[PDB]
Amino acid sequence: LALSLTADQMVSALLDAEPPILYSEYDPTRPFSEASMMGLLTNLADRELVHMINWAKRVPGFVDLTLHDQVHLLECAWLEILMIGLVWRSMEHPGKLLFAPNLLLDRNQGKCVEGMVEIFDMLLATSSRFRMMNLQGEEFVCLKSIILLNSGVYTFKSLEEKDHIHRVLDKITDTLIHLMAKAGLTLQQQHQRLAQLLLILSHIRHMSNKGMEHLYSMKVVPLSDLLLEMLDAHRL
């Protein structure tokens, strides 16, 4: 299924499966408090998770996995996925994080929550890196899908699911290289950019881990049953 797709088919499939950009319930007249900020971010993430779950089902190869494996991967990668999404839509807003079209925050506002500003700085740095590299939308969807399939693959006697995942991952790599070749990059440039993009995934993991660590220490505002169960997967 996923293995018979062409590069162009993979891209068009991933693009078509993109989730919408949701709005926060930010009232420009509060103005703020640790609790409110966290209320907004928590409220937003919860609604995003619902779209993320249905997006994952449209990622080629994902529904070929057992239900238990699908759960594992999403439990592992949910925050990384939210984060790369945030960084992606923040690309054209230097020094700012676009959580929603109506919620554009800077690092100083990130100080509203203890220990969150450190994460904001890393997210801003990541967005700056993407903007430098002039990351394309087709490349973005490839990276996000890689996170989904890769993050939990080493913490799952089937054994053949892990193998199925690796082949799909290889195809996404093929797709990435295909895009770069189309962009006119030389062979050396393709390999270099591919590495540059994948190395950023290590930083997205780092950000998720550090953020998750903080999130499940302060399980404050209502944490939607879905969110709690997602965090619980990492805690403690």
């Binding site: 619902v50 779950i53 249905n54 994952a56 089902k57 239900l67 699908q70 759960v71 999403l74 439990e75 049953d225 879905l226 169960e229 997602m230």
Partner: peptide, 9 residues
């Protein structure tokens, strides 16, 4: 699990 359900729909 909820995630279990939503994936299952």
């Amino acid at each position: 699990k909820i995630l279990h359900r939503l994936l299952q729909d």
